[PDB]
């Protein structure tokens, strides 16, 4: 963080959504088709996981932004799946909507008036009006279509009026009101809706029975058994277990999500859908896979050994299976066994991406999936977001000292010559910093580095007293460049006796175990000196205890 | 405090492969002031003071055709107490690259030490 570098733009909110296949194909830097990562000699193979279009790799420049490994941010690529696959995270949901729909009229087997009742209640809940959603159940007139359509009209009329009335006042905005109790009422309804949806056996719209769908641990759906009484009605339908492909499920849900778009609009939107986007079934399916930039898939180097990328092992396996199955299905054109291995390949590709993402929900040690990467131990959020390893910090055994102030900390000269503060050079402190610059990085109070107004850094580490003296007489020189006239030089000066430090003694059971102390550099010291008044708050006894110092 | 290190040249070679490596110093190529720590044989002088970065041994590998060194790295400086040269076995014949080096680290009672 640099005060000379302010930021004018800020993230105000984050929106959660699903990437569309059409969206990924356009943003993609290169299509990945090759399971090999390196050509002979040592150059990355074109169309492979290490392609230079995905960013700078192996002292080569990026073939998209042209920058080197340092400045190149890396670029996303894509894998074209030869057949659509169920997205593991949203399989349970697409399964619920598959079991809840009629295979004939392609509507949910629940009566349209009952479905509309949920759509009404869920629309009123997009805005903070729970009382109105319950008052809708009071609106009441084997039942004729002319009568039921009037009930849907009267209910829609109340919904449109209740929204407009609350919208007129400060009860709800155009973006809709959203509270935890509102969220509780939404969560209750979306649950009740799916429960009523799954309960119906015979379709209430068209009286024909649909064949029940069963599932296994892995993402795979199949047909169900059927007693004689169920048979007697599937034949009078027209008078009045087998595996189902991913394409068949997508095609069933495609029509159902079109025909039932009104309710799903509010089932999938927490607040009103101002973007007016269509709720499509292909969101639950993967026709492509995004290839993260080379930057986040670099091979781990431990000493001399350069390990193959953990991600590139399972990802190349998916590409081998993908290329093998698209060719093993291509020779079938010039035609049992070929259908057997075709289906078996259709299963091992779905299980390959399932292994690419997760384990405990795969096999039964396998390579960890992206879900496993976010939940390795405590998780990415707990280990690297809520908590982080920090710069400008030190650790040492604490030793008692009654000669320092109760608000002070005895800092060893070892820490004082390494821990620096970015002090901007001005007219009021030119004298103080000139000395620090002359003193250098090994003489306290000194300076390890000097930052010019152009943004560049000048290390004082290798320099002798002569160069340091010259740079000190160049600290308060006016900026020739008009693009940096606003800026002034900075001196990365040693920690002085006027500085603040955060003393921490773990476990930090209460905020008193993390206080601010005044730095007091004590010569010929190898330990952090602490006064006896601090012993209680830190719950620290000088029995060989350790404390963290943050600068 | 005494610490022992094993410098084995069998780290990459296996199953009697030809070796590009050898204890000592290669001709024509010689980076400045290394002779201050190591003797003609490439092994260090027993008694020499060493700090992190200083060369603890010297060798030459034919695969890279360059004279490389195994660096000493620790926050505590030491002195060489014992250097042992070990036969490589493996039907003998091969020269003894292998080697056990003992470091003597002097430890005066410091502020923090338990009694």
């Amino acid at each position: 963080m640099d005060i000379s570098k302010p930021v004018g733009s800020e993230i105000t909110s984050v929106d959660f959504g699903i990437l569309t296949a059409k969206e990924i194909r356009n943003l993609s830097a290169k299509q990945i088709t090759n399971p090999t990562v390196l050509d002979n000699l040592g150059h990355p193979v074109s169309g492979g996981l290490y392609d230079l279009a995905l960013g700078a790799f192996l002292r080569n420049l990026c073939s998209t932004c042209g920058l080197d490994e340092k400045f190149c941010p890396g670029h996303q690529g894509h894998i074209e799946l030869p057949v659509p696959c169920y997205n593991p995270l949203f399989f349970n949901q697409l399964y619920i909507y598959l079991r809840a729909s009629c295979l004939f009229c392609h509507h949910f087997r629940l009566k349209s008036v009952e479905v509309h009742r949920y759509a009404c209640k869920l629309r009123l809940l997009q805005y903070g009006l729970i009382d109105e959603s319950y008052k809708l159940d009071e609106i009441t007139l084997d039942i004729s279509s002319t009568l039921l359509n009037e009930l849907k009209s009267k209910r829609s009329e109340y919904v449109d009026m209740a929204i407009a009335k609350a919208l007129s006042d400060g009860r709800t905005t155009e973006r809709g009101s959203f509270t935890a109790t509102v969220n509780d009422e939404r969560k209750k309804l979306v649950h009740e809706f799916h429960k009523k949806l799954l309960s119906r056996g015979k379709c209430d719209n068209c009286g024909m029975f649909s064949p029940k769908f069963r599932k296994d641990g892995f993402t795979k759906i199949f047909e169900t058994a059927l007693n004689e009484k169920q048979i007697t009605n599937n034949r009078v339908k027209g008078f009045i277990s087998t595996y189902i492909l991913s394409t068949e499920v997508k095609n069933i849900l495609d029509t159902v999500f079109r025909k039932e778009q009104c309710v799903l609009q509010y089932v999938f939107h927490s607040r009103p859908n101002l973007s007016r986007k269509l709720v499509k079934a292909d969101s639950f399916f993967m026709d492509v896979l995004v290839v993260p930039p080379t930057r986040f898939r670099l091979p781990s180097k431990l000493g001399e050994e350069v390990h193959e990328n953990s991600q590139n092992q399972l990802l190349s396996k998916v590409l081998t299976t993908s290329l093998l199955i698209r060719d093993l299905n291509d020779d079938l054109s010039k035609l049992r066994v070929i259908f057997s291995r075709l289906m078996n390949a259709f299963v091992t590709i779905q299980n390959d991406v399932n292994a690419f993402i997760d384990s405990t929900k795969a096999q039964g040690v396998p390579i960890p999936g992206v879900k496993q990467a976010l939940e390795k131990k405590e998780g990415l959020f707990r280990k690297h977001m809520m908590g982080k390893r920090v710069n400008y910090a030190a650790r040492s055994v604490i030793s008692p000292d009654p000669n320092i102030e109760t608000n002070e900390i005895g800092v060893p000269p070892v820490f004082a010559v390494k821990l620096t503060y970015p002090e901007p050079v001005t007219a009021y402190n030119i004298a103080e910093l000139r000395q620090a610059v002359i003193n250098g990085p090994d003489k306290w109070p000194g300076a390890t580095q000097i930052q010019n107004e152009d943004g560049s850094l000048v290390s004082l580490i290798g320099m002798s007293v002569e160069q340091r003296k010259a740079l000190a007489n160049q600290l308060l020189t006016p900026s020739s460049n008009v693009s940096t006239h606003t800026l002034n030089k900075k001196v990365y000066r040693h920690i002085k006796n006027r500085d603040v430090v955060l003393m921490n003694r773990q476990p930090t059971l209460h905020k008193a175990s993390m206080m601010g102390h005044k730095v007091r550099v004590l010569p010929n010291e190898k330990t952090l000196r602490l006064h006896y008044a601090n012993t209680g708050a830190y719950n620290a006894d000088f029995d060989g205890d350790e404390m963290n110092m943050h600068f | 405090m005494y610490k022992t290190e094993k410098v084995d040249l069998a780290l990459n070679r296996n199953r009697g492969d030809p070796i590009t490596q050898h204890f000592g110093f290669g001709n024509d190529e010689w980076p400045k002031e290394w002779l201050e720590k190591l003797d003609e044989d490439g092994l260090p002088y027993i008694g020499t003071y060493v700090e992190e970065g200083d060369p603890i041994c010297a060798y030459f590998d034919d695969t890279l055709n360059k004279t490389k060194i195994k660096t000493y790295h620790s926050s505590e400086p030491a002195y060489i107490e014992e250097v042992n040269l070990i036969g490589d076995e493996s039907n003998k014949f091969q020269e003894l690259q292998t080697v056990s080096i003992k470091y003597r680290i002097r430890r005066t009672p410091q502020i923090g030490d338990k009694f």
Binding site: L457, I461, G462 | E52, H73
Partner: peptide
């Protein structure tokens, strides 16, 4: 060779904790 506007001169020196050019700058 670094390649910065500055000129390295070779003989790069490794400092534990800091890899610096013998000359102008340090990574």
């Amino acid at each position: 060779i670094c390649g910065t506007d500055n000129c390295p001169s070779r003989l790069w020196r490794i400092i534990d904790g800091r890899r610096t050019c013998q000359y102008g700058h340090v990574m």
